[PDB]
Amino acid sequence: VPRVATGAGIPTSRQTTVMVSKYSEKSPITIPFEISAACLTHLKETFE
Amino acid sequence: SFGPMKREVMEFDPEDPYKVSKMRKLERSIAKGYVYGADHQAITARFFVRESLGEVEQKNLGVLMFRLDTGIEMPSTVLVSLFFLSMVAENVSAATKNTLAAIYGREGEAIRTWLRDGAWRLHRVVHPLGCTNSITPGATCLITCSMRGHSYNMLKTEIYPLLVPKEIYLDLDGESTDEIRFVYFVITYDYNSDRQGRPSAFVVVSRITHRHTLINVLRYRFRVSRFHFLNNSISGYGPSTGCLGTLQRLGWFCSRDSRSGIVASRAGQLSVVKLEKFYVDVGPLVEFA
Amino acid sequence: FALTVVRTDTFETDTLLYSTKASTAVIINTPIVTKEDRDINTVFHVSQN
Amino acid sequence: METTVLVTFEQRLTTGDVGKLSRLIGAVIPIPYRHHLLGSSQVGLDAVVKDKTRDYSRMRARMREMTLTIMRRVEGNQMILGVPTHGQCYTIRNTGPVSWEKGDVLTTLPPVFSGEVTGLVSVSDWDLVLPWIVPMALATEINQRMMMLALLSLDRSHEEVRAATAQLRVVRYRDATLTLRNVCISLSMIANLSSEVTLAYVRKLALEDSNMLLMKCQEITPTEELNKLTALFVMIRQITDVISEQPAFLVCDVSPDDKSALCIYKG
Amino acid sequence: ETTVLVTFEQRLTTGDVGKLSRLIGAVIPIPYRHHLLGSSQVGLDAVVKDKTRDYSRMRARMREMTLTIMRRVEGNQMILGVPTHGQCYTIRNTGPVSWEKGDVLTTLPPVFSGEVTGLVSVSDWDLVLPWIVPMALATEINQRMMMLALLSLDRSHEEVRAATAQLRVVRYRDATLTLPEITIDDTVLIDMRNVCISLSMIANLSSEVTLAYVRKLALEDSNMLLMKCQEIYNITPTEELNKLTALFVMIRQITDVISEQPAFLVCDVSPDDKSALCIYK
């Protein structure tokens, strides 16, 4: 902080240590994604 | 040395619940060509069904099958559809009753009118067997009936729904939401005169999982039968009746898929309710009153 | 007696947003791909905190 | 593939006795508790069938605690067992007196020695007495006959009541006929005490009737008041413990000669 | 969905995640059952801080919850696998009952002997877990709610409180819990009716053999059950079959009134008596 030591009788502000720790916040994103079993069957199956 | 080097081999089979099912199916699909019936977490069974019972279920596919304890020793086990015992329940409109009484009834059935309406339902003749896929029309109908899981075409090509008829459904259709939806099956009696009543059947869907909170929403519906259930308790001393209602789990489906439909059969059509992604899952009987 | 009738009103609005350069330091990671299987469909859930 | 329980043959199983165990490859096995090694003295139900004062329901209270298990293969000195995964199909062997049919729900019951006393591959007092995998509707039926014979068991001195018992142990099902105490005290505490304690509770509730059913329900010391209702409800708990038979299988199809049936395992 | 990744969404601590790292395998209910949820829904605590706050509304609420099993607790991700019906799962003990291997477990709302901080009251929100009791303590604690609701029917204003305190210290296996100062609520009342109706029909169906069985047994036998219950013909058996069966419809229903949902059935219990292999949701 700034410090100004002035005046007579005026109560001066003693030198102030402001110490400050912020914090985080969490939000996950999620899409669901579907593939049918018959779609993945044709990857397996592979006929003539 | 020896011991721990062998146990690494039984440890490092990761990433699968066993890798015993999946790997050993492949070593028999390389052996025998691409094998069907192996990529199938659901569970089926093949059943010998006569030609006089072969109908409906044959044409439109994915529908309940029921066993009978018919009181006659020689044909003691007759297959019954969910369509079939609509000619027993009081819920079904008499046109809707006689629509399907004329489908089945062609000279190979109508004993089963006389030995279900006559030989009454004790709700222990019927057994929830399961749902169908892939009928085999030939000299003998041979129905692959699913037990636990979905009903579907082989090759995982199409989910076969559950064909619930309309009259058995809307009198205990549940509430409206978009969740998972359990299918229960409820037989309720109206104990009036004829020792069982006209044993009324219901396919009930509900979001409710728990037991007595589910029969409490039946305690809303069935006071007309419940007050008659109390009546024969004093209308007959010595003779008693049995259960009022009978609840059992039948399966579930995805509840955005609940939509009406129709089957296109002999003796006219029949308005049904089509429950698409129907995981068949039979539960135990809950006898209540 | 008299009566005070309160009532709310939902005014649907375009609400503009100004934020200075590089306000919030987002920290992310690679989207993990978990995999559920069913009888008939495979449901991939892709997520990252 | 599945769960595994090995059985260490403490008794010497002759190759001919292995020939009888290699016929029971499908059959169920009552295990006392899930553990990978068990003795042959543990495996089976003979440790339950054994007391001078042991009653049918008390054995059924023990067997309800015993884990059902299924035979997998008998390799000489060992018996390999599988604790069945719920929901899967299992080829169990119809060692009960009842032919099974396609779609029926199967319930485990202790074997009754009434006219069908049976043993097994026995050596040194251990056989492998095998529980009757019986249909569920007959399982409740067998239970009800046992209680009604015991409720009528005190009045043997009347021949007509004895003639009522003479019809009573005749149990007849599909292709099968077979012949068949605190539980009946539990039946009688509910029968007498509900007759007396409900009258001060029907006449208070019958005014407001939402389902409209208390109306013909009327047609049908506070320390000792609760003492009745405490020993009312706890005896209702005691009978429901020995009524709800916890269904065990669902036969999908039956193998011919009725020796076996593929059964999807439930409960 | 089955695997449920959970947002914490609150400002947790190192002392928080250290507790759940040893609690992996606990039972957490979720209402919505997504793959991605937040901790507002995840957890049971968010409904036990209601303003009415009796056992009558908390027990009937959470039977619409869906239970999950705590997995993979590192940092801020909670893997909650929704169990399937009939696989073997292990469960860490949430309430001090030893669970006594071989029996059915259930779901108890909250301890309700005070308001326990289930994890830590983080930003004035703790994550409270249900009690998983072995169905004997579940049925008994649900019995006494209706025992003392039938009591308040025919008492004036004090012999309730002189007899609830007789019956509220439930001395069970490892636990002496407390009935939650029984509030007369209508979910009890709709079902206390059907119990009183079920007691009525058993009196109707008691066909003078099932009636007189103890009163004939006291003349012949001297048993502990027979003496404590002193203070507390026809040739128609086929009809007695149907009357006893219809009596069995009632007692499988009136037990089902005060019994709960059958849930995790014990495979094995560790000698630590904390982690318990269990099947059958």
PDB file of C-alpha atoms in Angstrom, chain E residues 99-275:
ATOM      1  CA  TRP E  99     -23.599 -56.356   8.399  1.00  0.00           C
ATOM      2  CA  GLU E 100     -23.344 -60.040   9.497  1.00  0.00           C
ATOM      3  CA  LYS E 101     -22.422 -61.974   6.277  1.00  0.00           C
ATOM      4  CA  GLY E 102     -25.139 -63.703   4.242  1.00  0.00           C
ATOM      5  CA  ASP E 103     -28.049 -61.262   4.553  1.00  0.00           C
ATOM      6  CA  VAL E 104     -29.872 -58.562   2.615  1.00  0.00           C
ATOM      7  CA  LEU E 105     -28.890 -54.909   3.054  1.00  0.00           C
ATOM      8  CA  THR E 106     -31.155 -51.883   2.440  1.00  0.00           C
ATOM      9  CA  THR E 107     -30.994 -48.070   2.408  1.00  0.00           C
ATOM     10  CA  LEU E 108     -31.580 -45.999   5.542  1.00  0.00           C
ATOM     11  CA  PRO E 109     -32.128 -42.274   4.913  1.00  0.00           C
ATOM     12  CA  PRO E 110     -29.777 -40.579   7.406  1.00  0.00           C
ATOM     13  CA  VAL E 111     -28.514 -41.486  10.890  1.00  0.00           C
ATOM     14  CA  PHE E 112     -30.829 -38.704  12.213  1.00  0.00           C
ATOM     15  CA  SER E 113     -29.156 -38.748  15.633  1.00  0.00           C
ATOM     16  CA  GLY E 114     -28.319 -35.138  15.048  1.00  0.00           C
ATOM     17  CA  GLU E 115     -27.103 -34.012  11.635  1.00  0.00           C
ATOM     18  CA  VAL E 116     -23.844 -35.800  10.875  1.00  0.00           C
ATOM     19  CA  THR E 117     -21.273 -34.156   8.613  1.00  0.00           C
ATOM     20  CA  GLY E 118     -21.113 -36.902   6.005  1.00  0.00           C
ATOM     21  CA  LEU E 119     -17.812 -35.662   4.623  1.00  0.00           C
ATOM     22  CA  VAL E 120     -17.177 -32.040   5.810  1.00  0.00           C
ATOM     23  CA  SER E 121     -19.631 -29.122   5.736  1.00  0.00           C
ATOM     24  CA  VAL E 122     -17.930 -27.599   2.692  1.00  0.00           C
ATOM     25  CA  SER E 123     -19.259 -24.058   2.042  1.00  0.00           C
ATOM     26  CA  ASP E 124     -22.109 -25.104   4.353  1.00  0.00           C
ATOM     27  CA  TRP E 125     -22.661 -28.244   2.309  1.00  0.00           C
ATOM     28  CA  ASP E 126     -21.616 -31.675   3.516  1.00  0.00           C
ATOM     29  CA  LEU E 127     -21.926 -34.861   1.456  1.00  0.00           C
ATOM     30  CA  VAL E 128     -23.964 -37.237   3.624  1.00  0.00           C
ATOM     31  CA  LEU E 129     -24.249 -40.939   2.666  1.00  0.00           C
ATOM     32  CA  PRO E 130     -27.179 -43.273   3.409  1.00  0.00           C
ATOM     33  CA  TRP E 131     -26.991 -45.929   6.044  1.00  0.00           C
ATOM     34  CA  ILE E 132     -26.908 -49.410   4.566  1.00  0.00           C
ATOM     35  CA  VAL E 133     -28.493 -51.553   7.280  1.00  0.00           C
ATOM     36  CA  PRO E 134     -29.082 -55.336   7.138  1.00  0.00           C
ATOM     37  CA  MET E 135     -32.902 -55.142   6.644  1.00  0.00           C
ATOM     38  CA  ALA E 136     -33.612 -56.266  10.217  1.00  0.00           C
ATOM     39  CA  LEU E 137     -32.734 -52.850  11.576  1.00  0.00           C
ATOM     40  CA  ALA E 138     -34.504 -51.382   8.545  1.00  0.00           C
ATOM     41  CA  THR E 139     -37.785 -53.187   9.156  1.00  0.00           C
ATOM     42  CA  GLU E 140     -37.606 -52.620  12.923  1.00  0.00           C
ATOM     43  CA  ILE E 141     -36.994 -48.875  12.631  1.00  0.00           C
ATOM     44  CA  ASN E 142     -39.923 -48.699  10.186  1.00  0.00           C
ATOM     45  CA  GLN E 143     -42.065 -50.883  12.452  1.00  0.00           C
ATOM     46  CA  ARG E 144     -41.689 -48.524  15.409  1.00  0.00           C
ATOM     47  CA  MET E 145     -42.730 -45.498  13.331  1.00  0.00           C
ATOM     48  CA  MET E 146     -46.109 -47.206  12.864  1.00  0.00           C
ATOM     49  CA  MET E 147     -46.112 -48.784  16.336  1.00  0.00           C
ATOM     50  CA  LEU E 148     -45.993 -45.307  17.837  1.00  0.00           C
ATOM     51  CA  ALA E 149     -48.405 -43.903  15.247  1.00  0.00           C
ATOM     52  CA  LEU E 150     -50.961 -46.547  16.218  1.00  0.00           C
ATOM     53  CA  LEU E 151     -50.139 -45.552  19.803  1.00  0.00           C
ATOM     54  CA  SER E 152     -50.953 -41.860  19.273  1.00  0.00           C
ATOM     55  CA  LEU E 153     -54.399 -42.829  17.948  1.00  0.00           C
ATOM     56  CA  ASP E 154     -55.691 -43.941  21.366  1.00  0.00           C
ATOM     57  CA  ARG E 155     -53.540 -41.891  23.763  1.00  0.00           C
ATOM     58  CA  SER E 156     -54.234 -38.428  25.074  1.00  0.00           C
ATOM     59  CA  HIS E 157     -50.949 -36.489  25.148  1.00  0.00           C
ATOM     60  CA  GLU E 158     -48.374 -38.086  27.483  1.00  0.00           C
ATOM     61  CA  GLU E 159     -48.571 -41.866  27.350  1.00  0.00           C
ATOM     62  CA  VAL E 160     -47.279 -41.483  23.822  1.00  0.00           C
ATOM     63  CA  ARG E 161     -44.137 -39.846  25.197  1.00  0.00           C
ATOM     64  CA  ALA E 162     -43.917 -42.261  28.129  1.00  0.00           C
ATOM     65  CA  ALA E 163     -44.029 -45.205  25.701  1.00  0.00           C
ATOM     66  CA  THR E 164     -42.083 -43.835  22.731  1.00  0.00           C
ATOM     67  CA  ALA E 165     -39.099 -43.408  25.069  1.00  0.00           C
ATOM     68  CA  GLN E 166     -39.627 -47.049  26.025  1.00  0.00           C
ATOM     69  CA  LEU E 167     -39.279 -48.026  22.369  1.00  0.00           C
ATOM     70  CA  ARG E 168     -36.925 -45.499  20.755  1.00  0.00           C
ATOM     71  CA  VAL E 169     -33.556 -46.740  22.024  1.00  0.00           C
ATOM     72  CA  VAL E 170     -33.206 -49.455  19.383  1.00  0.00           C
ATOM     73  CA  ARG E 171     -30.411 -51.676  20.699  1.00  0.00           C
ATOM     74  CA  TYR E 172     -29.302 -53.410  17.507  1.00  0.00           C
ATOM     75  CA  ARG E 173     -26.010 -55.084  16.532  1.00  0.00           C
ATOM     76  CA  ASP E 174     -23.248 -52.513  17.313  1.00  0.00           C
ATOM     77  CA  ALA E 175     -25.811 -49.671  17.270  1.00  0.00           C
ATOM     78  CA  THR E 176     -28.171 -47.938  19.699  1.00  0.00           C
ATOM     79  CA  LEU E 177     -29.952 -45.469  17.433  1.00  0.00           C
ATOM     80  CA  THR E 178     -32.937 -43.201  18.063  1.00  0.00           C
ATOM     81  CA  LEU E 179     -36.404 -42.903  16.546  1.00  0.00           C
ATOM     82  CA  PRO E 180     -36.667 -39.344  15.207  1.00  0.00           C
ATOM     83  CA  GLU E 181     -39.337 -38.015  17.634  1.00  0.00           C
ATOM     84  CA  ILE E 182     -42.151 -39.619  15.689  1.00  0.00           C
ATOM     85  CA  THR E 183     -44.144 -37.099  13.661  1.00  0.00           C
ATOM     86  CA  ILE E 184     -47.615 -38.194  12.577  1.00  0.00           C
ATOM     87  CA  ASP E 185     -47.556 -37.812   8.801  1.00  0.00           C
ATOM     88  CA  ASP E 186     -49.994 -38.879   6.130  1.00  0.00           C
ATOM     89  CA  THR E 187     -47.722 -41.309   4.248  1.00  0.00           C
ATOM     90  CA  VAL E 188     -47.799 -43.319   7.457  1.00  0.00           C
ATOM     91  CA  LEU E 189     -51.551 -42.713   7.752  1.00  0.00           C
ATOM     92  CA  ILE E 190     -52.472 -44.005   4.279  1.00  0.00           C
ATOM     93  CA  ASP E 191     -50.453 -47.125   5.042  1.00  0.00           C
ATOM     94  CA  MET E 192     -51.416 -47.412   8.717  1.00  0.00           C
ATOM     95  CA  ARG E 193     -54.973 -47.768   7.384  1.00  0.00           C
ATOM     96  CA  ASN E 194     -54.048 -50.683   5.114  1.00  0.00           C
ATOM     97  CA  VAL E 195     -52.169 -52.313   7.993  1.00  0.00           C
ATOM     98  CA  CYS E 196     -55.280 -52.007  10.187  1.00  0.00           C
ATOM     99  CA  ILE E 197     -57.257 -53.420   7.252  1.00  0.00           C
ATOM    100  CA  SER E 198     -54.715 -56.223   6.891  1.00  0.00           C
ATOM    101  CA  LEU E 199     -55.071 -57.035  10.588  1.00  0.00           C
ATOM    102  CA  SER E 200     -58.836 -57.152  10.061  1.00  0.00           C
ATOM    103  CA  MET E 201     -58.783 -59.714   7.263  1.00  0.00           C
ATOM    104  CA  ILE E 202     -56.493 -62.120   9.139  1.00  0.00           C
ATOM    105  CA  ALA E 203     -59.164 -62.155  11.854  1.00  0.00           C
ATOM    106  CA  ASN E 204     -61.688 -63.047   9.152  1.00  0.00           C
ATOM    107  CA  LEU E 205     -59.538 -65.803   7.628  1.00  0.00           C
ATOM    108  CA  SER E 206     -58.552 -67.356  10.985  1.00  0.00           C
ATOM    109  CA  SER E 207     -60.602 -70.535  10.695  1.00  0.00           C
ATOM    110  CA  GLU E 208     -60.537 -71.825  14.321  1.00  0.00           C
ATOM    111  CA  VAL E 209     -57.505 -74.106  13.855  1.00  0.00           C
ATOM    112  CA  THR E 210     -55.064 -71.333  13.099  1.00  0.00           C
ATOM    113  CA  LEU E 211     -56.820 -69.501  15.968  1.00  0.00           C
ATOM    114  CA  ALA E 212     -56.718 -72.057  18.754  1.00  0.00           C
ATOM    115  CA  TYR E 213     -53.246 -73.452  17.993  1.00  0.00           C
ATOM    116  CA  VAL E 214     -51.389 -71.687  20.819  1.00  0.00           C
ATOM    117  CA  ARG E 215     -54.373 -72.066  23.154  1.00  0.00           C
ATOM    118  CA  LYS E 216     -54.294 -75.814  22.502  1.00  0.00           C
ATOM    119  CA  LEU E 217     -50.492 -75.907  22.777  1.00  0.00           C
ATOM    120  CA  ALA E 218     -50.315 -74.380  26.277  1.00  0.00           C
ATOM    121  CA  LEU E 219     -52.282 -77.350  27.627  1.00  0.00           C
ATOM    122  CA  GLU E 220     -49.599 -79.783  26.381  1.00  0.00           C
ATOM    123  CA  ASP E 221     -46.254 -77.972  26.086  1.00  0.00           C
ATOM    124  CA  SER E 222     -44.126 -75.582  28.181  1.00  0.00           C
ATOM    125  CA  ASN E 223     -42.074 -73.421  25.798  1.00  0.00           C
ATOM    126  CA  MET E 224     -40.490 -69.978  26.143  1.00  0.00           C
ATOM    127  CA  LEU E 225     -42.462 -68.678  23.160  1.00  0.00           C
ATOM    128  CA  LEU E 226     -45.548 -70.449  24.480  1.00  0.00           C
ATOM    129  CA  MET E 227     -45.459 -68.886  27.962  1.00  0.00           C
ATOM    130  CA  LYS E 228     -44.667 -65.328  26.857  1.00  0.00           C
ATOM    131  CA  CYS E 229     -47.601 -65.541  24.429  1.00  0.00           C
ATOM    132  CA  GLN E 230     -50.118 -66.537  27.113  1.00  0.00           C
ATOM    133  CA  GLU E 231     -50.097 -62.937  28.335  1.00  0.00           C
ATOM    134  CA  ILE E 232     -49.700 -61.439  24.862  1.00  0.00           C
ATOM    135  CA  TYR E 233     -63.840 -80.664  14.226  1.00  0.00           C
ATOM    136  CA  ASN E 234     -64.104 -79.597  10.589  1.00  0.00           C
ATOM    137  CA  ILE E 235     -63.225 -81.925   7.709  1.00  0.00           C
ATOM    138  CA  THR E 236     -62.660 -79.064   5.271  1.00  0.00           C
ATOM    139  CA  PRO E 237     -58.930 -78.854   4.510  1.00  0.00           C
ATOM    140  CA  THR E 238     -59.320 -77.755   0.882  1.00  0.00           C
ATOM    141  CA  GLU E 239     -61.097 -74.622   2.108  1.00  0.00           C
ATOM    142  CA  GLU E 240     -58.447 -74.186   4.807  1.00  0.00           C
ATOM    143  CA  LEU E 241     -55.892 -74.234   1.986  1.00  0.00           C
ATOM    144  CA  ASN E 242     -57.509 -71.206   0.356  1.00  0.00           C
ATOM    145  CA  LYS E 243     -58.049 -69.320   3.626  1.00  0.00           C
ATOM    146  CA  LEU E 244     -54.438 -69.806   4.725  1.00  0.00           C
ATOM    147  CA  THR E 245     -53.244 -68.782   1.256  1.00  0.00           C
ATOM    148  CA  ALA E 246     -55.354 -65.611   1.322  1.00  0.00           C
ATOM    149  CA  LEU E 247     -53.934 -65.054   4.805  1.00  0.00           C
ATOM    150  CA  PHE E 248     -50.493 -65.361   3.197  1.00  0.00           C
ATOM    151  CA  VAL E 249     -51.427 -62.655   0.710  1.00  0.00           C
ATOM    152  CA  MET E 250     -51.895 -60.305   3.652  1.00  0.00           C
ATOM    153  CA  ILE E 251     -48.770 -61.105   5.643  1.00  0.00           C
ATOM    154  CA  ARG E 252     -46.561 -60.862   2.564  1.00  0.00           C
ATOM    155  CA  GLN E 253     -48.153 -57.430   2.117  1.00  0.00           C
ATOM    156  CA  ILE E 254     -48.212 -56.143   5.705  1.00  0.00           C
ATOM    157  CA  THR E 255     -44.547 -57.105   6.063  1.00  0.00           C
ATOM    158  CA  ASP E 256     -43.912 -55.349   2.734  1.00  0.00           C
ATOM    159  CA  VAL E 257     -45.461 -52.245   4.316  1.00  0.00           C
ATOM    160  CA  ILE E 258     -42.707 -51.969   6.927  1.00  0.00           C
ATOM    161  CA  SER E 259     -39.981 -53.781   5.012  1.00  0.00           C
ATOM    162  CA  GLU E 260     -37.816 -51.928   2.537  1.00  0.00           C
ATOM    163  CA  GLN E 261     -36.333 -52.606  -0.871  1.00  0.00           C
ATOM    164  CA  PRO E 262     -34.043 -55.631  -0.918  1.00  0.00           C
ATOM    165  CA  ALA E 263     -30.601 -54.427  -1.954  1.00  0.00           C
ATOM    166  CA  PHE E 264     -26.947 -55.499  -1.678  1.00  0.00           C
ATOM    167  CA  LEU E 265     -26.785 -59.168  -0.667  1.00  0.00           C
ATOM    168  CA  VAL E 266     -23.543 -60.081   1.071  1.00  0.00           C
ATOM    169  CA  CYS E 267     -21.054 -62.262  -0.784  1.00  0.00           C
ATOM    170  CA  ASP E 268     -18.249 -61.982   1.798  1.00  0.00           C
ATOM    171  CA  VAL E 269     -17.251 -59.735   4.697  1.00  0.00           C
ATOM    172  CA  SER E 270     -13.617 -58.818   5.336  1.00  0.00           C
ATOM    173  CA  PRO E 271     -12.114 -59.548   8.780  1.00  0.00           C
ATOM    174  CA  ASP E 272     -11.693 -55.765   8.978  1.00  0.00           C
ATOM    175  CA  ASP E 273     -15.547 -55.785   8.765  1.00  0.00           C
ATOM    176  CA  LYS E 274     -15.413 -52.643   6.598  1.00  0.00           C
ATOM    177  CA  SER E 275     -15.406 -53.692   2.927  1.00  0.00           C
TER     178      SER E 275
END
